[PDB]
């Protein structure tokens with residue numbers, strides 16, 4: 309008999325799995341929401357704002373109405389290379405944002421030391437991708453890397469139709485802190501990472517007024533062989549592609565149809581993405597420069613380190629947020645957490661979710677969320693930033709690991725507003741002027757210098773319908 313080869317690997321379940329980390333794909337968790345689990349790992353936070361700041365100029369007439377198509381193409385070219393490095397070195401890309409990606413090497417406590425070495429090497433090789441690369445006249449196509457290590461908590465929250473996850477805890481906070489100490493081309497280790505690492509491998513230096521350290525060099529001992537060392541480390545990497553599947557970047561590429569599993573995984577993925585996955589929408593429909601309203605919600609907790617308290621709080625907030633968003637076809641694009649604040653990047657006006665009065669509704673939705681979440685047990689402060697303008701939407705990443713992501717100055721603005729104007733609902737000038745709501749529903753705010761925003765324009769507090 310003949311032996312035709314090539315296992316078919318393009319099933320819907322596999323396509324869905326591209327949008328998710330191994331943490332979720334192979335997780336098999338209880339149905340309770342919230343669900344929490346705990347482990348140890350090494351984290352890598354790669355700041356990619358250097359080249360995703362490209363977005364503004366892709367709206368220029370120069371790109372002849374193909375700005376979004378060109379932007380996703382060039383971004384994915386670069387980001388794909390980063391993802392491949394992460395994957396080949398054994399890491400799990402947890403999420404993408406417009407300005408960063410976060411990767412995890414989950415391992416038993418005893419192997420943290422050796423895995424940090426692996427992750428440093430990976431980091432250095434990532435920087436190596438960009439050492440001599442630019443466009444037009446600007447080589448700011450470079451990245452900044454923070455690494456952290458230690459205890460990590462995982463939270464899964466959602467309802468019967470939608471799920472979201474976060475990793476949280478000090479190591480997660482640490483990786484964020486480390487990355488924003490990094491200059492271009494730097495690899496910065498959190499204090500704990502530095503404490504736990506193989507100091508014989510690496511030369512570091514101090515970071516002024518900081519216990520974090522900068523990696524100057526990976527200088528391995530005389531008879532060290534990284535490839536053999538890596539192979540030893542793979543013993544502790546549950547899903548590293550191997551044997552007959554050593555040619556694949558992800559084990560998830562080998563997933564077979566399993567309706568129960570697919571039911572669980574699809575809950576993490578937006579319906580419009582599922583439509584594309586199911587070949588019921590053109591594969592390029594979701595790459596666009598689109599006017600939207602961003603409602604960025606930040607929840608700060610009474611006790612920031614107590615995962616057991618924050619989980620139920622986020623779940624309670626989520627249940628309300630999703631109900632309010634349904635009422636106006638708003639969608640949660642991302643959920644993020646560091647600094648102890650949990651933030652929901654909500655979007656009004658995504659593809660196929662048009663509808664006029666987007667501004668009035670965004671503001672009313674923001675206020676509703678604010679009022680409700682402010683009453684949630686353990687939520688100390690709610691802050692909401694509302695900004696409206698043209699943003700890039702598209703699936704960003706590698707073929708095998710990518711996510712629908714929104715990128716733009718207005719996303720950054722809403723994000724900065726919620727942090728620099730805590731405890732209130734704020735909006736930009738577009739939103740204020742477009743709502744046409746009475747002017748006394750607002751308060752004109754002092755201008756604040758916000759990191760990453762040049763010329764925010766006049767900003768406003770949405771005070772609401774009444775003085776009280």
Ligand SMILES: Nc1nonc1C(=O)c1ccccc1
Nearest residue numbers: 403405408410474475644645
């Ligand atoms: N915490 C988290 N758990 O999953 N993702 C995050 C997160 O904050 C993040 C932020 C920016 C980019 C990528 C991830």
